Each structure stands twice: as C-alpha cells, then as structure tokens.
Amino acid sequence: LPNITILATGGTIAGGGDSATKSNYTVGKVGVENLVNAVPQLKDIANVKGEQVVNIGSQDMNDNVWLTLAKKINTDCDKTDGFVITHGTDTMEETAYFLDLTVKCDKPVVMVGAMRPSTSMSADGPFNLYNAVVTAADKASANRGVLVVMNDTVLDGRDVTKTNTTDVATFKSVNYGPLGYIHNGKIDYQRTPARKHTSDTPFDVSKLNELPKVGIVYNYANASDLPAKALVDAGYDGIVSAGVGNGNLYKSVFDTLATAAKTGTAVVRSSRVPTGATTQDAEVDDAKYGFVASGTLNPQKARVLLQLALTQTKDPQQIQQIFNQY
Amino acid sequence: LPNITILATGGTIAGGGDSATKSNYTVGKVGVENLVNAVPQLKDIANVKGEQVVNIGSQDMNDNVWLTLAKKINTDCDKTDGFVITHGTDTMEETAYFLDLTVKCDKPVVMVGAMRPSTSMSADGPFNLYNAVVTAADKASANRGVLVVMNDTVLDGRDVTKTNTTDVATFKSVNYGPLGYIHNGKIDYQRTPARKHTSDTPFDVSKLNELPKVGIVYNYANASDLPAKALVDAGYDGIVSAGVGNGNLYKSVFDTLATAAKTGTAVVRSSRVPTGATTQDAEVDDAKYGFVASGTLNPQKARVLLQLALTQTKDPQQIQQIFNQY
Amino acid sequence: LPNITILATGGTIAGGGDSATKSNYTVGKVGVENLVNAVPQLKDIANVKGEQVVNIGSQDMNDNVWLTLAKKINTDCDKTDGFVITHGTDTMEETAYFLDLTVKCDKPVVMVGAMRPSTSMSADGPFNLYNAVVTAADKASANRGVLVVMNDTVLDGRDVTKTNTTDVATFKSVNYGPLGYIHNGKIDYQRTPARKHTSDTPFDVSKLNELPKVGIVYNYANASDLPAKALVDAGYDGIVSAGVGNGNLYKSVFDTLATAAKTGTAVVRSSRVPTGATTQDAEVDDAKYGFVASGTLNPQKARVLLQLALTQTKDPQQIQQIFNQY
Amino acid sequence: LPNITILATGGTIAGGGDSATKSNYTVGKVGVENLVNAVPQLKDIANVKGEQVVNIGSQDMNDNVWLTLAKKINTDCDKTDGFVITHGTDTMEETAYFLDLTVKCDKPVVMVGAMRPSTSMSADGPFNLYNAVVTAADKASANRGVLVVMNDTVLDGRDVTKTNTTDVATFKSVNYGPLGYIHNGKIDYQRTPARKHTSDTPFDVSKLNELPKVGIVYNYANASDLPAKALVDAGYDGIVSAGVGNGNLYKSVFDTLATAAKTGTAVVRSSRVPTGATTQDAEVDDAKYGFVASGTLNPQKARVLLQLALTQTKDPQQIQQIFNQY
Ligand SMILES: N[C@@H](CC(=O)O)C(=O)O
Ligand SMILES: N[C@@H](CC(=O)O)C(=O)O
Ligand SMILES: N[C@@H](CC(=O)O)C(=O)O
Ligand SMILES: N[C@@H](CC(=O)O)C(=O)O
C-alpha cells in the first residue's frame, strides 16, 4: 500500500449535527482521527496518517492557513506518497487553486469535504473520504496538479467551483470539464490541465508570513463606488472586479478603479457570471486603463492569482502574461 | 395583427463594431427604428411601434431607468396589446425582476437582447427580437409575469440569469427551468411561476422618485470588512451579502453586518454560488442576528426585492415574509 | 400523522451487495418491512405501512406490473393519505409516466429508488426514502401528478429522466426543471405541470389485462431496417422511432414505417437526443405519412403514451392531439 | 495565409426553406461554391478550396460516405494545410468519431454544421463556417484528433454529442468537456483527448470498400427480443445494446444477446442514458457472457468503434481492449 497523510482544516465533513434529520449543525467539531475511525475500510487501500492543522468553517479560511498548508506540504513532500486535505466546501475552490500555484510536491494533492453533516442520513463524508484517498494513492493522479474529489469525480483545482448551495453534486469544472471518474476504486483519466501548475509555477511562499491585500467588489445596476473607494483608501495592493457580463463595470466603479489603476493598485476585471471567459478585445480597452482581464478565473480565483502575481511584480502587462499562463 | 410597443434601452442588441468578424463593439449606438428595419418579417406578426427610452449599455443601468420603464408601461398599458424591451444582457436579469414586481399591466411584457452585435456575422438579435414579439403577441403569454426571451426560450423574470459571458445560449432559468420553447412562431407553455408577480404585488412605483439604497458585498477567503463598513457609514437602507456556500459570511464581514442589522440596516444573506437556495436553518441563526435569507434569489436579484420591500417595512420579520412570497 | 402506504417493487434501494466499496450488487432482494425498519425517523413524520407488490430489478419491468400498480393505487386511494413506490432507477421514468396518466387518485403518489446498494458507503437509499415520505406526507404535493423524489428534488412524472449512469444526482427534468426542492424536511414548490395528469386524463385501465404492443427502433448512420421490419411482421399496434436530430430517420427505416402506417400501424417520431422536442413542420411531412411527433417525450416515454393512446383510438390525428395534451 | 480544403457533405448548413421565419426546410441542396461565397470574410484568414463530395442530409449518412471521406483526406493530405467538412448535425458525432479513428493525416480536420438552414433569420452556418476555418488554420489545433467546431467551441470527435434537438448550442462534450473556446478569431486550448486517434490507431481503410455490419437495439420496460433476433438471423457481425441505466438489459433481450456473443456475433453493452460510463463490475458479468462494456461511448459511437474493431479481430476480449484505449 502507499503512504497517505490526511491534513484536516475543519469543514462540514468534520462537523456534527443536532440529529439525523437536521442540517442545522455546527462546523468543525471533530479531528482527523475519528474521521478515519468512522471509515474502517481505509485500512484496505492506504497507510493513513492524520494531522490537524486547524479546525474551522471554510467560510473563515484566510491567508495564514494557506501559508501554513503550503509550507507543510512543501516540507513533508518526501515523507509520504500523497496528501488528502479535509476542508469546508464553501472556499474549497480558493484553497485548491492557491495550493495549485504554491505546492512543489509533484505528488498527488487531493482536497475533499462533505455537503452533509457526519450525523445525517446518507452522509456523503465517508465515501467521499474513501475516494479522495483512492485518488491520492493511485499514481496516475500525479503531475495533474492539485485535485478536488467529490461525488465520484476528480476535478482540477483551477477550474473547479461550487455550483449549487446544498447539492452533494455541487462541485464541477464548469468550463473544461473534469479530469476523471471513479468507479469501483479505479479512475479513468482522460484529461489533464494544460495551464501550468505546482512545480512549473514561479511562486515561492516558503518565507512569506503575509500576502498582498486584494479585495473584490461586485457590479450591478446602480452600483455604489463606496466599496471600491474603501479598498483604495486603505492602500490595497489589488482589486478584482466581479463584473457584469464580460467583465463590464458600472461607470461609478469604472471611474474609481480607473483612478486606482494609475495610482499604484492592480486591477483585474473578472465576472459575476459563473461560466465563460472575461476576455480582452471587447467593450473595455484594458491597455488604455491599465487593467488585466481574468479569463475563465472567477472573482475568488482571480484574487488568488493576483495576490501571487503581486509577490513578484506590480506591472499590469506582466500580470496579464501571468493571467495568460496559470 | 396586434399592436406591439418596443421600448428600447440600448444593449449589444443595438450594437455594432467596425467589422463583422471582430469582437470590438460599442453598445447603445443604433436607434430603435433601425432595429425594427433589420427585421421586416416583424411586419407579418404585429403592428410594431418603437420608442427610445435611453440608449445605454446595461452595465450603466440604474434605478431611474427602472422607475421610468415601469411608469411608462403602467401608463401606456391599455393603448397597446403588449410590450417588448430591448436591453443589454449584462443586467437584463435585474431589470426583468424589477419590472416583474412593479408592472401592473396584465398584458405581456417581454425583454430581449443579443449576445452578438448587429453588424456581426450570424447576429443573434434579429431572430431574438422576432421571437420576443411572437411571445408578446401570444395571448397565452399573459398572466405569467415579466418574461425574457432569448434563444427560442421563454424564461420568467424571477429565475432567469446570465450563465455564460459570451454564449448565445447564456440565459437560463437555473433553478426551476423555462416556461416554454418557441418553434415556428408558436409557444408550448408547460410552466407558470407560482410566486406573486406584477399586479399581485404591493409595490407601487407610480409616485416614487428614488428607491432605498441597497449595496452588495462579496465574501471570499480573507475578505475585507471595509466595503460593508463603507455602506453602513453612508447610511445604506439595506445590504445584500454575496455569501459563500449556503449564504455564509467571512468572520469580519459577519461582524460588521451583525452590527448594521441592530442599527436598522436590512441585511439579506444571498450567495455567490450560481444555483440553489440560501436557506434558513443552516449555520446562521437568522432570527438572532435579525437577518433575512434570500432563497433562490442571487445577490443582484435580492437587492431588487430588498429595495422594494424597504418601501413597505423595515421589520426583518416582514422582509423575510416578502422574500418567501415574491 | 398521515397514513402513508409504501408499495415496493424492487430495485437497488432494496438490493444488497458483498462489500461497501465494491460496486457489484444483486437487485430487488430486501422486503418492504426491512426498508421501513432501517429508517426509524420515518415514525416522526408518518404512520408507514408496507406492501410488497413484486421484487424485481426495474430493467425487467413490464406492462403487467404497471397495471397491477395503477389498479392497486386506484382501489386503495381512500384508505391512505399518500403513496410511495420504491422502485429501481433504470426504468423509473417510464413507470412514473405510466402512473401519471392512469392513477385517478389525487393524493400524493411519489416514486423513489437508490443509485447505491443499501450496504455500500454513503448509501442514498435511507435519506431518499425519508424525503419521499416527506413529499407523500405534504398536502401541498397533491394535484401535482405523480412525482419522483431523488436527491432532495421533487420531479414531475412526465419530464423526469435519468441523465447519468452512476451519479446519485441522475434524475433531472431536463426540459422544464423541478417542481420543488427539499430542505430540513420541508418543500418549497415553485412549479406544477401544465400538461394534464391523473384524474384529468381519459385513460381508464381498471379492466385492461394487457396493453397494445409498442416497440422502439433506433436510427443511426447506415441503420438496419431489420428491427422495424420484425415488429411490423409480429403485428405491432405501434412503433416509436428513436430518430436522429429532430426525429429524423434513415431512409430505409422511414420507408418501412411509412408502409406500416398505411397498413394501420401507429408510428411516433421521437429522438435519441436527450433534451428538446421532436417538432412538426421541420423536414418530415407527418400529415402525408400518418406520423405523430412526440414533442419532448423521449422514446421510452413516447411508448408509454402511445400504448395508452391506442386503448382509445387508431387515428393518427387523434393520437397527435393526445400527444399535444398529455 | 494557410490553404484550407472544405469537403462538403450536405446538412442543414446547406439547407433552405421558403421563408426566413418558417421552420420547414429541405436539406443538402446548396452547393459549396455558394456556401463559401456567402462568407467573403473567409479570404482574410485562408485561401479556401471548395470540393463537393455528396449533398445529403446526415440522417442518410452511411459507410460509403465515411470511406470516400477518409480516403479523400489521406490522399489529399500533403496538398493542403487543413480540412473543414461541412455536414449535417444529426450524425456529425458518428462521422466525427469514425474520421477520428481512420484519418492518418496529422493536420487539423474540423467538422462543422448548422442547426438553422442558411435561409433562417439568424442563420448560424456563416459564422460557424468561419470559426471552422479558424480552427483549421490555427496551427495549435494540430495533433488533437478530429474536431467539431460549433457555437464558438472546439470539441473532440470522441466525446462530442448532440444534446438538444433544435438549439444552436446543442453540441457538448458531455463527460469530459471541450478542448478550447474561440473568441475574436483565436483559440485558447486548455485540453487534448487522452485516448488514441488519427495516425496512432491500428485501423486502415485505404483499400476497404465495405465495413462489418453492426446494429443497435434499444432496451425499455417490456422490451421486445424481435429486433435483436432479426439481427443475428441476418448474421450481423456486431450488436450494440442501448441498455437501461448502467447498460442493463431486459430479460428476453439479454438471452438473445448471450446467444449472439458466444456463437460468433460481437456484443457491446452501452446505455440509452445520455452521460456516464457503462462500466464493468456492476450488475452484469461481462467476461462470463462475452460482452464488451462501452465505457462513455453511447450507442452510435460504440457502433463506430465496434465496426472498426472487427476489421482487426473478433475475440470479445481484444475488442474490450480496443474499448479501453481508443
Ligand atoms: N460552512 C461549511 C460548509 C461545508 O463544508 O459544507 C464549510 O465550508 O466549512
Ligand atoms: N454591455 C452590453 C452587453 C450585451 O448587451 O450583450 C449590455 O449593455 O449588456
Ligand atoms: N438495475 C437497478 C438499478 C437501481 O435500482 O438503481 C434497477 O433498475 O432495479
Ligand atoms: N437533418 C439535418 C439537420 C442539420 O443539419 O441541422 C442533417 O443532419 O443533415
């Protein structure tokens, strides 16, 4: 068998309910150990070693945890065959993409959570954990980047997102589809990311204790400029716009961000629209204004890349090239 | 043939670039009487009369355009057999729901735009416009609320949303599906909305000059409390949270919005997740904090309803009731 | 609490296996009183009585089970407050549509199965059944036709189909979407079917021992006419063509079915394509050949309706109208 | 500018009706000279050579057209820089997979069609054609397999399928998603098919003038054995079974097929279910009865692979192997 480490961070997968009938519950009661001691079948597929890193709802996920997850993984690379990260579902797609850009252990890194509490009828957690370990142990999983494994499906960390608020089938790669499917403890990979990841990225967080400050502002009919102005006033390093349609902006927000972009703030145009690319060559002349278009990166995911871009450069043209590559 | 009034507001639908192949276009350029003439086949299904209300990209849509439109429709109600509104696609989903809650005319009101400019190859707007007049002229279209017609589909104002940044098929009713499909100038209707709309709402905008101020804040890992603080300091009537997962909030945003709610700001919890409801009895004790769960309403649609609700009440209790009925 | 009757027919929901992480299983094996006993939370929402009808895999479902089911619900209607039918997943969409047109009880009638064996890890059966009883118990579920409840979603008998071979989220209403979602054992209904069902149909099976023979043939490139020829020669009362695109047929198949239409056989054009309507007034002149367009009814569903159609009439115009109403 | 050969085979893209608004049309009557001419913007991206092969609707596609096409592409290979094939949409997903297996040429082959006839009001053919030539001319499109280019999307020949009967966005790669998206005449490829293709397959058809005979039977409730029986009694080389759920079979059809398989007729189990794999080690024991499992190949595509498999072999288990690799 291969050697698999489970790094826990909390989530519903660790969370406990009032009873079997209710999804009013608390997030993150239990640790790595008895997520295992509730799925004895793991003994048949892996040598499983579990360690607690934090115990939180992913809605409170932050840069500190990302830094410590990355450094951990980059350090214990060669004491294990692969990693599984138990995590809340809410911000799983952010963590996954951050680790997809910062981990250099080319070994399998898989993330997993649960949409149902552990104490509920037909709790997804167990079989989800089974299948993340499978993906982690299978050696075909390596060099594909950081993974999310949910509902018998293996998804790439860059394209994966939470598409539904309550459904066990929420996680999908909405633009380019999944990498593989899991039936009977086996995977059929028919796809791999072309965007560079893990050890082909230039990002180094090994010495960092904080990350550049990047916020997100939302666009809509009659949008206030007040949220954009508070991020500039507080000297934010970057701002991602969750634009309307193809990264378009309400004029008031446009004006403020146009100003911010010529005054030491990096501006990435993303979209509130859940699928498809925020392109160049449309309604907004990015060159004139010094903005960067995010492509298929949603706001949250754009934020992740922008922070990392900003650990290297503050020039928009080079941030655009970075957005064209990872 | 029935009399159809086209109210034009702008959009790509009235767009046009410097080329048929190139994507670079300007919106709100062509006049309504031109739009009509590029679709003479209109001549055989209605007596079309065009009126220009504004000529803008819908990224710049605002409360005044909404109020103008609703007042125009309610006033001219019984001098026409139905209405079409030509509109950009970026915030069509917001206008549509606005009019769904404020039009009293029980004749059909159909909104329509185009993902590709008029000058473009295989332009979508012509047939979109035709189908939208077919919808508006159909007597079965009446009593279904305000409709959006795009890509041979009839969709309800409440559930319709833009799912894709560039695809002609972007508009979908993502939670409950379309009302009907259009083939050969005819509709087979299999669904009507069950929530109260149009003439059954208490919202009366006929004497109203402004709407209560509602802003939207976004949640993500390490989210700043500054955007939300800026809205509270400006004395906002309501705030809509674009939450993570089932309407959850980053801890520092939670704190600012809790505080706002005790000082008589409406706070609605919605979700950045494109599908599914933000429910009560999840992780957040709505009753304690005086919050409202938005249901299947996404943030930009929650704002629409929250502004109108605020014209009747500021009791979160009654606002929740409205969010459960409209 | 309401008296709910469970009518069991088989399926994986009732079909065990050897180990929890091996996807082998035998189907239709456990009895109704075991299923009920395995879910004690039932006792909090309903007084549940089980009756075994059959115990097969749904792949082996047949006209005789369908007639027993309908006659049973029609006799026992007034002894209970709602029915649930445990049933295999493979042809649940066929049976649901059959009962949708023949049950005369307007009390809730809910079907349910399981995509995973009841012994496997994170088995859907127990929660699936609870939600089905929740729906059968909810009075709001009356007058909506026959329902399929799977994955916290209530779907109408007519539009519902299996979209995926293994996924627990397989059942969707792919043309018009769900009626309602379930959360914390409560249902928000936003939709009901417009097409007529249950007691608003003329089908009366109370004294039928058999149904008209209807068979389905597939179309593809270079398709054999042979299968259509074999059904003709055994004297089939009707044939449904799974066509290509919009109900189109390989020439050889067309001409056989055309001959047969002249010799009193009912011919319905449907489509191998999973979503969308087989329409009239495209490439096939149905009037000329005595053919019927199925609309959004896929081949196996189109079959159900043609069988029941044939218990009233043989005229192609009347069958078309039936196809347009039910 | 690159040299692009267009091989026209017909389709709605070469179809036409009496009126822009009326849906009745006839297929494959517009010549390639007139198609090309209807897109003058072609000159700007290629030097295009129009060659008619046949002018049929793809409902009548057969083996002889497939062979004329393969041969013509391998022969004409070194005289051109890429291939575009105008076709009908109804079987495009069959032809695409056949050509994907038999073209030995490494240059790009791109299939294109239209869902609306060229006379239709917002005809998709002219822009679709342009995009086809873009994909064909982009040098990064090389080495990906045979492509289908519809609705601004570049889809691979193995996974692409028609999901809807009338919608312009009907072509999707429903299990593993698309290869790239086209904006503004350029393509960002993020994926490539893993399974083998074009130059890297065993199959040569340079000299074959006939392909083995392979038919498809459909499973459903109370399904008839007569179609299956008809096909063995004609001594068909192979039978594909569109099964219910995970390739399950009605009892009487199971028998007639068990027979066929271990008396020298090959039998692939596929599924009527539009997505997901017909897997081994579920309900049926494939090795015992001598059945091949089709994986994520649907019936029509499994037939393409099985036809071609039988040029090389007849043992079940080497056909199972071709079904794990191609
Ligand atoms: N709030 C939870 C939700 C979940 O895990 O399902 C989390 O993200 O930690
Ligand atoms: N910016 C445009 C985009 C479109 O119409 O497609 C609008 O006004 O929404
Ligand atoms: N073959 C089974 C599958 C299931 O029940 O899920 C049946 O249809 O009975
Ligand atoms: N029946 C036509 C449909 C189309 O081309 O859109 C064909 O496949 O030839």
Residue numbers in the entry:
A (entry chain C), B (entry chain A), C (entry chain D), D (entry chain B): 1 to 326
From the paper:
l-asparaginase II (EC 3.5.1.1) is an amidohydrolase that primarily catalyzes the hydrolysis of l-Asn to l-Asp and ammonia, but that can also act on other substrates, including l-Gln. This enzyme has been used for over 40 years in the treatment of leukemias, particularly Acute Lymphoblastic Leukemia (ALL), which is the most prevalent cancer in childhood. Many studies focus on the EcA2 from the K12 strain (EcA2-K12), which differs by four amino acids from reference biopharmaceuticals, including Elspar (EcA2-4M). To understand the structural implications of the four-amino acid differences between EcA2-K12 and EcA2-4M, we solved their crystal structure in the presence of l-Asp under the same crystallization condition and data collection method.
All monomers in the asymmetric unit showed the l-Asp in the active site. The monomers of EcA2-K12 and EcA2-4M were essentially superposable, with Cα RMSD values lower than 0.4 Å. The structural and comparative analysis of EcA2-4M and EcA2-K12 showed a good correspondence between the positions of nonmatching residues and their electron density maps, with the only exception being the valine at position 27 of EcA2-K12. There was poor correspondence between the electron density map and the spatial position of valine 27, which may be due to the characteristics of the added residue and its location in EcA2-K12. Given its hydrophobicity and constant interaction with a highly solvated region, vital for the opening and closing mechanism of the active site loop, this may lead to greater dynamics compared to alanine 27 of EcA2-4M. Additionally, among the amino acid sequence differences between EcA2-K12 and EcA2-4M, only the amino acid at position 27 is located within the enzyme active site (Val27 in K12 and Ala27 in 4M), more precisely in the N-terminal flexible loop. The much lower catalytic efficiency of EcA2-K12 for l-Gln, which has an extra CH2 group in its side chain compared to l-Asn, is likely due to steric hindrance caused by the bulkier side chain of the valine at position 27 compared to the alanine in EcA2-4M, which allows better accommodation of l-Gln. However, considering the turnover rates, the EcA2-K12 variant is more specific for l-Asn, with a k cat Asn/k cat Gln ratio of 66.7 ± 0.2. However, for the EcA2-K12 variant, the disappearance of the Tyr25 resonances is only observed in the presence of >600 μM of l-Asp. Our data indicate that EcA2-K12 has lower activity due to the higher conformational dynamics of the N-terminal active site loop.
